[PDB]
Design a protein around this ligand. Sequence first.
Ligand SMILES: CO[C@H](c1ccccc1)c1nc2cc(F)c(F)cc2n1[C@H](C(=O)NC1CCCCC1)C1CCCCC1
Lengths: 11, 230
Amino acid sequence: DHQLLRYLLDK
Amino acid sequence: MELTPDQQTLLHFIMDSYNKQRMPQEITNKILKEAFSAEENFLILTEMATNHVQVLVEFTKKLPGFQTLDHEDQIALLKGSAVEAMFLRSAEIFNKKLPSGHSDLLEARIRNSGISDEYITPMFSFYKSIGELKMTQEEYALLTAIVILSPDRQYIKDREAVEKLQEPLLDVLQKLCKIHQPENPQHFACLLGRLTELRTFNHHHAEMLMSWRVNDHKFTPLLCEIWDVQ
Ligand SMILES: CO[C@H](c1ccccc1)c1nc2cc(F)c(F)cc2n1[C@H](C(=O)NC1CCCCC1)C1CCCCC1
């Protein structure tokens, strides 16, 4: 659901 | 009373991370430059808000211990604080000193943004209340970090893990209030009080945005994830 937030956090 | 070496280190680390944000003058110069239409102001807001969320995720990631937290709790903290952090940053920008007459024009330009008058009144009430506290750059930085690391957010599994991270930041802020404003011993309580008023902008945020006098309410995919829009 929050794919972009998860991406920015896990980058 | 005075900051310990570990507290001075934490403060400088938070400050350095906090200063990565877009400069207040960049924002106010744009709004003061030309009088924009409701349609142009909506797009200025979405671009400003997208930059803010991007910088806020970078600031959040640097908060000591944040990367050790449960991944689902990390998302919950970000989603729970994004809107409050945006209004706290807007209050900082609004209360920055400008040449005589400019803050009057900035107020008027924000009143004519395109949103309903019912949402404007509480924003200025919060900005003027923040302004009377005469907060330093360090107070805004620590208060933003305290807002992000709020253990009382919905959908948080491990509240104690979040509490353990917020505690040293609350301790540093309390010392700074005693040093910057020794005349006002209620200063720290007042700052924690503003944090409770900040939370009021959450519930009706999507309603405020959809009340914008525009034909199409187009938000960026990142804003759709963090706000309750589209
Ligand atoms: C939180 O946004 C406020 C808002 C007011 C009216 C309608 C919609 C929003 C708001 N309060 C402000 C106070 C100020 F001092 C200021 F310079 C600008 C302010 N804004 C808007 C803005 O640019 N916000 C960004 C959001 C990301 C973090 C940095 C600031 C701005 C208002 C004029 C129309 C364009 C959008």
